[PDB]
Amino acid sequence: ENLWVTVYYGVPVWKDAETTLFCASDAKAYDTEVHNVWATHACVPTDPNPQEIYMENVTEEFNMWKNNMVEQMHTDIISLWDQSLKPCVQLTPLCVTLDCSYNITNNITNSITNSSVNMREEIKNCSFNMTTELRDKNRKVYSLFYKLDVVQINNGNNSSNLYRLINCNTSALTQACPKVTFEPIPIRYCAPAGYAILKCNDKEFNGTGLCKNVSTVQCTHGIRPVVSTQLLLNGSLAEGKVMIRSENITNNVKNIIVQLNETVTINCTRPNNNTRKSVRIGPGQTFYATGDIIGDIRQAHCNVSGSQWNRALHQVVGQLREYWNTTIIFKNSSGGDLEITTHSFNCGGEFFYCNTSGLFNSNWTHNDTASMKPNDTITLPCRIKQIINMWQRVGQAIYAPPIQGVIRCESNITGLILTRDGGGNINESQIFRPGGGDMRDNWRSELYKYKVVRIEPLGVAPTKAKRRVVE
């Protein structure tokens, strides 16, 4: 009867959280017995029993664009990079001037493919001074380099011109600590006490909005946090239906996230063998030079099954009718920078910039058979890079090492990020195009189900009973 206000404890309560999640991994990352493979800071191992408990008859609004996990995520990634970079020796003497010859005693100088990658063969080899362990002694050593990591100077425009590194004239560079690897590891972000992570188990749930099929969880599932521009590699699948997401679907600047339910064997590869030469500069300064390769040296390139691309495109364009029944066009990005213009990723230390130009050459306006029936395997040119400035910050730069041997990157694509045209008509013809300046969406494209929540166990309710009384 009376509203005697009683208190209770031990029931879930939901509020937004700002905290940190922690490492997790299997035995491989610690059975490798390398100093640290690529997250390893005496990181906690994983929990073999994920207590992912399912809840129903509740609902909540979920958003990945208001999420704080991505900011802390890339902050921790930069911390990993810096901490792994502390043991790396400095490469300021490596910036010293270098004289190059383009042609060498290789069997092939212009390979079979011609997609503006062989015309700009971008292969030279240069000699330059370095320090000997005796300060009074220096010595000229030679290695191999491309044209992307350097630029011409002293413009006697073409007579054996010397070159200079792009990042040294503005920033600092250091070794990559070649003993550390660069491949991903299955991660499972874990929740500390006082917090939890809610996975939206609704098979139909798009990016944001209301979700009900709740899964309260302490530690996430297996994540493969690899960087990619315009693409999602080695990621999860789309359950039940192709997923299409956008912050403001009406607005055009907001990028469009796509998650497929069918993968593709993307093999970007350098088959021709590589070279490594460890050369002592100083007491600790040891440079890993790209030696002179023996045999035929073709430019590194890449392969995809364009037929699976075509059928997955039929799927997504059957799904893409937001306000339409048949209109779509794809156009390549008309400008920007190489870090955003191509599909850039890291693999075996080498930064593979594989050129995803095979998308826009298509007109799926009404019919899909005309591009599904030409089932054909696509070969494409993929460039290689040694240095990088991750997240566009001009600070310390990494010099990835030679990879001596061959390089294969065979992987599963599962998603894409795009943008619709800026100055597009109202209903004449919609246009999409690729965009990769936002490096942050690649990480929320899988944590979209995951929302971090605090825990306020306090509860209150009225009842008719009462506590002890004296008089």
């Binding site: 922690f22 640290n36 709740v214």
Partner: protein
């Protein structure tokens, strides 16, 4: 049903309270396995940085949260157990209701939703009104 298993349950949610508090401060079970003592995988350099130290800070902050909880429970005479009786009747400010519909037609979420503002008041009552006017024992009747 480790922490949740109350989908549409308020009165039925008045019996599964302890299954939540069993795993409240059990992040230690998730933390004891860190093996961050000096080295885990092969070896490490000093390598004790923002991740580890601010994980420790988060341990500290959750500990402080639940300790300030436990001390304001003790202020309420409430550390004895989860179910926590009060001598406080609600001042007549809410709308019409029933002793069961409030206790039956929600899942422990709608309550804190609709009692956002008022909640503070009740605290101070159970913080002060239940406490100051408490006396020690009785005088008249005994075993003999």
């Amino acid at each position: 049903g480790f922490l949740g298993t109350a989908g549409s349950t308020m009165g039925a949610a008045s019996i599964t309270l302890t299954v939540q508090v069993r795993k409240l401060l059990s992040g230690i079970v998730q933390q004891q396995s860190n093996l961050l003592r000096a080295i885990e995988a092969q070896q490490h350099l000093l390598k004790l940085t923002v991740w580890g130290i601010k994980q420790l800070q988060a341990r500290v902050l959750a500990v402080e949260r639940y300790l300030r909880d436990q001390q304001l429970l003790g202020i309420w005479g409430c550390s004895g157990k989860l179910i926590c009786t009060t001598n406080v009747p609600w001042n007549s400010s809410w709308s019409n209701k029933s002793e069961r519909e409030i206790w039956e037609n929600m899942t422990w979420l709608q309550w804190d939703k609709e009692i956002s503002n008022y909640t503070h008041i009740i605290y101070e009552l159970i913080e002060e009104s239940q406490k100051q006017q408490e006396k020690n024992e009785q005088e008249l009747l005994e075993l003999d």
